[PDB]
RNA sequence: UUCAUCUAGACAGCCGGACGGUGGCCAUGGAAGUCGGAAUCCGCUAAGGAGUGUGUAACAACUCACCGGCCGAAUGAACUA
């Protein structure tokens, strides 16, 4: 049934191409089904979010480029877990609606941390024995009657640096949530010329 | 008492295993056949029983 | 801190003197007298006697605040409108009596706000699925038949 | 089925030289030189461009072409052992008795001495295979690290350390005491 | 041998999601996918079973079917002797 299903997907993708004038290439990495549910709910009527397997999308895009050749720039941008948010509305407000959902997880183990960790001086309150993370990573602190208290601000990891297991678990029990998870538009197709999302 | 990290490490070698029905051999957890020829390399395998 | 606010959605048979031996185990730790909760549950679900309906309980300052969760299934049952059942002895009550499209559609209207369904048609399809679970018939048609018809457009659900 | 030709590619980085006489492989890197006898395997090595070796089996059976890939993996292990090295980190797991593990000299033999395992009065001795370095890791509680060029020696000595500390006459699911490899990686980080 | 999957991207591998109506209905004292019987829908969907297993007093928390990310060429099952 792959023939009929993929053909249907190609057809609907075309229809989105014609009606919707512009597009939001989005980095949907680490976006829960529920998270996308509210995001699409917000985008109801306003825009639409279509999802496809990158290779399937690319094959369709070549085929559709056959007649609309304005998409070779789109060809590289279909990489990794990325959703085509089709839009016939103002890109600025579309970008806002995309940005909104940032459900923060504490130091998701392994994933590339997108934020510059500043562990502010705070009474941890967490149990003494678990100092192991602090002690292994240095992180000067003070064990006062079990309840350790971070003495000074420590940058264990940063943005763009995959959290090592140790610090990841450390901020996991420390309940600092840097891993704001929400679809992050990487590029935005604009009526014939894609531009990096940043501007919007 | 052993902390859960070390306990998982030790269970990885002691308990996260398989057992052959015919020859009681201790096999890798995801093994499909027994490695002993005396059982005919049977595929009659079970998970090694978990503690409590 | 009494200011602590804690939500306690629990599905329970309505309008009757609910199981203390089920409700106390939860409120107890929070410092909450079982009886008062019991009055709140019974009064709030009075209409739903013999109708197992979810009821949220807000808790703050060692008090309760009942609010009968408009659960789609229980709303469906109330639409079936069965007078208080002798659930104690009337076990296996096959509550599949018929309902005109009116009530199901209105329930779908009630539930659309949270539901993600882009059309009142879709939300009605959801509630009809709930009725399928119930066994409840809709106007001498299987609720799946109604769902398919609505998809076809023949049962045009008014969008508002 | 006797595949006509099966081939595998061995990538040679910049700082290593591979000299292959008949089936004796001598790999030289920054960390040292390893040598392996592979005369038991009947394969053909051929240099392509001094950064690529091709190892091939002609008209070989199923087992023969399996052992071809085994040889490729062994030479790759040699090259990564002379480039990055190998480190196996073992943690000591104990419920009641801390396991007293240290390095002792007996006639200049470099034995890893184990005492108090399950409270045992026996002294367990693990020889150190030549080329394997032992360091006891600070900032991690009860962790011993075995490092070296040769993965065979490093992992084998770690395996002897693990095997000598097996529990007898007890439910091994409950009596989880022992010395277990918690990490197996390379000495130089993230190369 | 037969049946399937595969450049419209196969199998395995590793990583992401794995929802909402809804604790679906009936029972149990408790049963919220997961002690039982029967119902397997609908929506949001790239996608998720009224659930494949671990688990709880029930929860929860995990895991999988399903779809996704990477690599890019063959692969899986049941059979026959
Ligand atoms: Mg005994
Ligand atoms: Zn066996």
UniProtKB/Swiss-Prot annotation, chain A:
Keywords: Cytoplasm, Isopeptide bond, Phosphoprotein, Ribonucleoprotein, Ribosomal protein, Ubl conjugation. One of its GO terms (cellular component) is cytosolic large ribosomal subunit. This is Large ribosomal subunit protein uL10. One of its GO terms (molecular function) is large ribosomal subunit rRNA binding. Component of the ribosome, a large ribonucleoprotein complex responsible for the synthesis of proteins in the cell. The small ribosomal subunit (SSU) binds messenger RNAs (mRNAs) and translates the encoded message by selecting cognate aminoacyl-transfer RNA (tRNA) molecules. The large subunit (LSU) contains the ribosomal catalytic site termed the peptidyl transferase center (PTC), which catalyzes the formation of peptide bonds, thereby polymerizing the amino acids delivered by tRNAs into a polypeptide chain. It comes from the Eukaryota. Component of the large ribosomal subunit (LSU). Mature yeast ribosomes consist of a small (40S) and a large (60S) subunit. The 40S small subunit contains 1 molecule of ribosomal RNA (18S rRNA) and 33 different proteins (encoded by 57 genes). The large 60S subunit contains 3 rRNA molecules (25S, 5.8S and 5S rRNA) and 46 different proteins (encoded by 81 genes). The 5 acidic ribosomal P-proteins form the stalk structure of the 60S subunit. They are organized as a pentameric complex in which uL10/P0 interacts with 2 heterodimers, P1A-P2B and P1B-P2A. uL10 directly interacts with 28S rRNA. One of its GO terms (biological process) is ribosomal large subunit assembly. Belongs to the universal ribosomal protein uL10 family. It is found in: Cytoplasm. There is a cross-link at residues 12, 95, 142 (Glycyl lysine isopeptide (Lys-Gly) (interchain with G-Cter in ubiquitin)). The modification Phosphoserine is found at residue 66. The keyword Heme does not apply.
Swiss-Prot record, chain B:
There is a cross-link at residue 17 (Glycyl lysine isopeptide (Lys-Gly) (interchain with G-Cter in ubiquitin)). Coiled coil: none annotated. It is found in: Cytoplasm. Signal peptide: none annotated. It comes from the Eukaryota. Component of the ribosome, a large ribonucleoprotein complex responsible for the synthesis of proteins in the cell. The small ribosomal subunit (SSU) binds messenger RNAs (mRNAs) and translates the encoded message by selecting cognate aminoacyl-transfer RNA (tRNA) molecules. The large subunit (LSU) contains the ribosomal catalytic site termed the peptidyl transferase center (PTC), which catalyzes the formation of peptide bonds, thereby polymerizing the amino acids delivered by tRNAs into a polypeptide chain. Component of the large ribosomal subunit (LSU). Mature yeast ribosomes consist of a small (40S) and a large (60S) subunit. The 40S small subunit contains 1 molecule of ribosomal RNA (18S rRNA) and 33 different proteins (encoded by 57 genes). The large 60S subunit contains 3 rRNA molecules (25S, 5.8S and 5S rRNA) and 46 different proteins (encoded by 81 genes). This is Large ribosomal subunit protein eL40A. It comes from Saccharomyces cerevisiae (strain ATCC 204508 / S288c).
UniProtKB/Swiss-Prot annotation, chain C:
It holds the Pfam family Ribosomal_L11_N. SMART domains: RL11 (SM00649). Keywords: Cytoplasm, Isopeptide bond, Methylation, Phosphoprotein, Ribonucleoprotein, Ribosomal protein, RNA-binding, Ubl conjugation. Although not reproduced with a second method, methylation at Lys-6 cannot be ruled out. There is a cross-link at residues 125, 141 (Glycyl lysine isopeptide (Lys-Gly) (interchain with G-Cter in ubiquitin)). InterPro entries: Ribosomal_uL11 (IPR000911), Ribosomal_uL11_C (IPR020783), Ribosomal_uL11_C_sf (IPR036769), Ribosomal_uL11_CS (IPR020785), Ribosomal_uL11_N (IPR020784), Ribosomal_uL11_N_sf (IPR036796). The modification Phosphoserine is found at residues 20, 33. GO terms for biological process: cytoplasmic translation; ribosomal large subunit assembly; translation. The modification N6,N6,N6-trimethyllysine is found at residue 6. It is found in: Cytoplasm. GO terms for cellular component: cytosol; cytosolic large ribosomal subunit. Its main location: cytoplasm. The modification N5-methylarginine is found at residue 62. It comes from the Eukaryota. One of its GO terms (molecular function) is large ribosomal subunit rRNA binding. Belongs to the universal ribosomal protein uL11 family. Component of the large ribosomal subunit (LSU). Mature yeast ribosomes consist of a small (40S) and a large (60S) subunit. The 40S small subunit contains 1 molecule of ribosomal RNA (18S rRNA) and 33 different proteins (encoded by 57 genes). The large 60S subunit contains 3 rRNA molecules (25S, 5.8S and 5S rRNA) and 46 different proteins (encoded by 81 genes). Component of the ribosome, a large ribonucleoprotein complex responsible for the synthesis of proteins in the cell. The small ribosomal subunit (SSU) binds messenger RNAs (mRNAs) and translates the encoded message by selecting cognate aminoacyl-transfer RNA (tRNA) molecules. The large subunit (LSU) contains the ribosomal catalytic site termed the peptidyl transferase center (PTC), which catalyzes the formation of peptide bonds, thereby polymerizing the amino acids delivered by tRNAs into a polypeptide chain. Present with 68500 molecules/cell in log phase SD medium. There are 2 genes for uL11 in yeast.
């Amino acid at each position: 049934g792959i023939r009929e299903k993929k053909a249907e997907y190609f057809a609907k993708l075309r229809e989105y191409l014609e009606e919707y004038k512009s597009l939001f290439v989005v980095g949907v990495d680490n976006v829960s089904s529920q998270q996308m549910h509210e995001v699409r709910k917000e985008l109801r009527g306003r825009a639409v979010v279509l999802m496809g397997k990158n290779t399937m999308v690319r094959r369709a895009i070549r085929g559709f480029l056959s007649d609309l050749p304005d998409f070779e720039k789109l060809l590289p941008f279909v990489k990794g877990n990325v959703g085509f948010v089709f839009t016939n509305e103002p890109l600025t407000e579309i970008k806002n609606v995309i940005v909104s959902n940032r459900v923060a997880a504490p130091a998701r183990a392994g994933a590339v941390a997108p934020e510059d960790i500043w562990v502010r001086a705070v009474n941890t309150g967490m149990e003494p024995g678990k100092t192991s993370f602090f002690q292994a990573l240095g992180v000067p602190t003070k064990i006062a009657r079990g309840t350790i208290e971070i003495v000074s601000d420590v940058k264990v990891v940063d943005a763009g640096n995959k959290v090592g297991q140790s610090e990841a678990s450390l901020l996991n029990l420390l309940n600092i949530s840097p891993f704001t998870f929400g679809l992050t538009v990487v590029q935005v197709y604009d009526n014939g010329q894609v531009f990096p999302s940043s501007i919007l | 008492i052993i902390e859960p990290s070390l306990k998982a490490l030790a269970s990885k070698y002691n308990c996260d295993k398989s057992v052959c029905r015919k020859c009681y051999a201790r096999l890798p957890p995801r093994a499909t056949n027994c490695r002993k020829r005396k059982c005919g390399h049977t595929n009659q395998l079970r998970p090694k029983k978990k503690l409590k | 801190d009494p200011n602590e606010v804690k939500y306690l959605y629990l599905r329970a048979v309505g309008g009757e003197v609910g199981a203390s031996a089920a409700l106390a185990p939860k409120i107890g730790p929070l410092g909450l007298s079982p009886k008062k909760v019991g009055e709140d549950i019974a009064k709030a679900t009075k209409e739903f006697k013999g109708i197992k309906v979810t009821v949220q309980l807000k808790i703050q300052n060692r008090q309760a605040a009942a609010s009968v969760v408009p659960s789609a299934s229980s709303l469906v049952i109330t639409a079936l409108k069965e007078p208080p059942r002798d659930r104690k002895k009337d076990k296996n009550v096959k509550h599949s009596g018929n309902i005109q499209l009116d009530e199901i559609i209105e329930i779908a209207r009630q539930m659309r706000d949270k539901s993600f369904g882009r059309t009142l048609a879709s939300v009605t399809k959801e509630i009809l699925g709930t009725a399928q679970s119930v066994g409840c018939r809709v106007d001498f048609k299987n609720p799946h038949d109604i769902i398919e018809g609505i998809n076809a457009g023949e049962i045009e659900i008014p969008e508002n | 089925m006797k595949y006509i030709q099966t081939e595998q590619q061995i990538e040679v980085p910049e700082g290593v030289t591979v000299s292959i006489k008949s089936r004796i492989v001598k790999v030289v890197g920054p960390r040292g030189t390893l040598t392996k006898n592979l005369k038991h395997i009947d394969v053909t090595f051929t240099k392509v461009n001094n950064q690529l070796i091709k190892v091939a089996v002609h008209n070989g059976g199923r087992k023969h072409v399996a052992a071809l890939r085994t040889v490729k993996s062994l030479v790759d292990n040699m090259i990564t052992g002379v480039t990055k090295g190998y480190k196996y980190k073992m943690r000591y797991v104990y419920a009641h008795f801390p396991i007293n593990v240290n390095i002792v000299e007996k006639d200049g033999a470099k034995f890893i001495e184990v005492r108090n395992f399950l409270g045992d009065k026996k002294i367990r001795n693990v020889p150190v295979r030549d080329g394997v370095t032992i360091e006891f890791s600070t900032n991690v509680k009860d962790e011993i690290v075995l490092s070296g060029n040769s993965v065979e020696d490093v992992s084998q000595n770690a395996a002897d350390l693990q095997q000598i500390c097996r529990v007898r006459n007890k439910d091994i699911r409950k009596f989880l005491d022992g010395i277990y490899v918690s990490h197996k990686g390379f000495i130089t980080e993230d190369l």
